[PDB]
Structures are given as C-alpha cells and as structure tokens.
Amino acid sequence: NWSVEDIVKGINSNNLESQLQATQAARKLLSREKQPPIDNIIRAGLIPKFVSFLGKTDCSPIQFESAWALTNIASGTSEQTKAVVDGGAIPAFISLLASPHAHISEQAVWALGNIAGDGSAFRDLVIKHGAIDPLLALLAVPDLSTLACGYLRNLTWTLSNLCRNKNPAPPLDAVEQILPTLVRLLHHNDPEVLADSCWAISYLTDGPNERIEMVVKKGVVPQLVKLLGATELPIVTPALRAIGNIVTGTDEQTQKVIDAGALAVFPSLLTNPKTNIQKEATWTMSNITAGRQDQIQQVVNHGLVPFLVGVLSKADFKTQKEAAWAITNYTSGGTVEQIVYLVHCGIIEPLMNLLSAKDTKIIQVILDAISNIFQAAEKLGETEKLSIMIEECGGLDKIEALQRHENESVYKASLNLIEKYFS
C-alpha cells in the first residue's frame, strides 16, 4: 500500500512499467474502504498524468488502472469530479468507450456516468463531447440478453445520469436520441436495469408536458404500470415516480395512465408499509382527482375513495397532506353525485380531525374542500343536514376557533363558512 510520495516517484519516472505499477498502487489506494486519500492524490498533481495514460493504446493495463483510479476520484465530491474534468478526462474517456477490452470500455462508461451525474452542466458538457453515439453503440445488439450483466447495468446507470437533472433538462435532441435504447432497457428482465431505466424515465417526465409527451409517445406507460406492481421496492419506487410525473401533464396524458390499468394497483400502493410509496401514491392520486369528472368516476369505480378516506384517517402527516389535496381536487371537479358518494364513504370525520393540524396549508386546503362539499349540498337543499354532520363530527368548534387564526385566507374562509352555513 504505497505512500502518495511513492506513487508520485513511480509516476514521474519516465518508465512505462514503473508508471504502470505506481498507477495500480494509486488505484488500490483510492479503492480503500476507509477514507481513501482522494484529495491527497489530487493535490499531488496526479490527474493530468492519469488522463495521459488513458491514451496509451499500447499498455491497455495502464489505460485500465488509470481509468479506474480516475473513476474513483470522479465518483467522489463535486469538487473532486471537477478535478477529473479539469484534467481533460472527458474526451479521453469517450475515446476509451471504443476500447476492444470490455473491462476498459466499461471503466470509461462508469467514469462518464459519474461525471454526467454531478449536475446538468457536466451532463451537457459530456453530451457536447459526443458521448452519446459511442454509448448507444455499445448496446446496438439485437437482444440485450447477450450482453454481460455488469456491463449492461453500467450502461443503463450512465444513460440514466444523462437523463438526470433540471435547470436545464437535457437537450431535447439528446433525449430523442437516447429514448429508443432506454425503452429497450425498460423491458429488460434484470431488476437493476429495470430500476435505473425507471429512474431515467422519471427524470425525463419531470417537466413540461412536452417532455412528458415525448416519453408517453414511446408506448412506455403500459410497461410502467406493470413495473408499478413489481415486488422489488427499488423498481416500484421509480415506477411510481414516473407514473406520478405523467399525471401532472394533460388530461389526455393522465388518461393513458388510467387506460393502462394503473388505478388497480392503488389499493395496495395507498396502503404500502413504506411511507414514501404511500406519500407519492397519494400525491399521484391528487393529480388524478384534479382531472375530468369521467376520470374521477374511474377513481370511484376502482374503489379508491375508501382508500383516500383511509389515508386521510391514519398516515404519516405528509401523506395526510397529500390526501387532503386529493379530496379538495376531487370536490372541485367532481359532480354533486360524486361528492355525495365521498361523504357517504366517511370523508367528514377524518377531515374535521385534521383541522387540528398546526399546518397552515392543510387547513386552507381542507376548508376549501368543505366549501366545495357545501356547494354540492346547496344544489340539493341539503345544506343543513351537512351542517349537522360537521357539528356531530366535532368540526364546528374548529372552524370557529379558526376565525381568530393568524393567516388571512384561513380566518377569511373560516368566517365565510360559519355565516353561510352555521347561523
């Protein structure tokens, strides 16, 4: 386990073999479990030397060792990754992508993956040096199944990083270019490949509806829905995210999610033991109850209202906050008949109980839901009857105490309610 001092002696001898051996030492050092001396290595000025070895097509072993060493540096902090980039590593790794040694090609893949993932600027800079053709070319085989697992998984993870990040989103033409390959990966039988594809798809659908559209046009929604009900949390998690993003777009885009069978997975998603799954499932549901009355009706037909009632009753508070949002949206666009169904399913009690939440937003949201339900009651004349349920379920006091509340919108609507409906 060489000292940094020795590695530098090795690397600075102009002896190819001493160089090779010193680099290998460096690589083992940087692979150390506890606190590998990345900064030390960086400060010794070794990076340019390493980047230079990447070009020695003759000693492929020093190409490999220096790739690996570089990879372990770039896999660290954003400043560490910057040092690898400043060293000139990007074009050098892109050339390596074409190495006849899979183990070397693979290193280059891994390196570009870590550089692209630092953020959007490095992502784009890597795209500019033309990484995409050589990357995609590594996957230009009729059946992905003939590729080695580790290899495929690295390719998938790297491509995922090139899809990652906002401000800005990746170049559109880059996203067009990558999609068809990313869609093949999304249909692959390997759990890790699947998870990282979904992550990629979820990155790409986080944005303007135009972005959502290019993804949905590829026909991935049915595959997403399938992965939505997988047994592996690492797959479900990103799949739910991609689904959730898509239903933030147009109603027609949301309809494709409904059409693919997505809603049938929500009984279990909305009761999922993992809190974030539940949270995001309720979030997703809120952007579905924000849609058309026919889409709300499908939420109804799938038996999901009793599940929303459930989540509103007992769940992590954040989840409850999403549930309140889903009910307000439901009461907004819903028909009177649908709103009536919501009450019969037991929405009032758990609604009133959350008016005790010391969270200004959820209060504003709930009171909004209460108006919408009252206005439905008005069209039936049944405004009084409702007024009673809310007193019987303990709400009247809370809507009252909320007159005095610090926020304006809160005490405004708190008062509005009492006058129209409670006097």
């Binding site: 993003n245 933030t248 809120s286 952007n287 849609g291 949206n329 009461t331 907004s332 909004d368």
Partner: peptide, 8 residues
C-alpha cells in the same frame, strides 16, 4: 382547485 402539483 382543481390544482396540479408537480415535482419530486
């Protein structure tokens, strides 16, 4: 309402 919320 009806309000779309992204992000995540």
């Amino acid at each position: 309402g009806s309000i779309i919320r992204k992000w995540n």
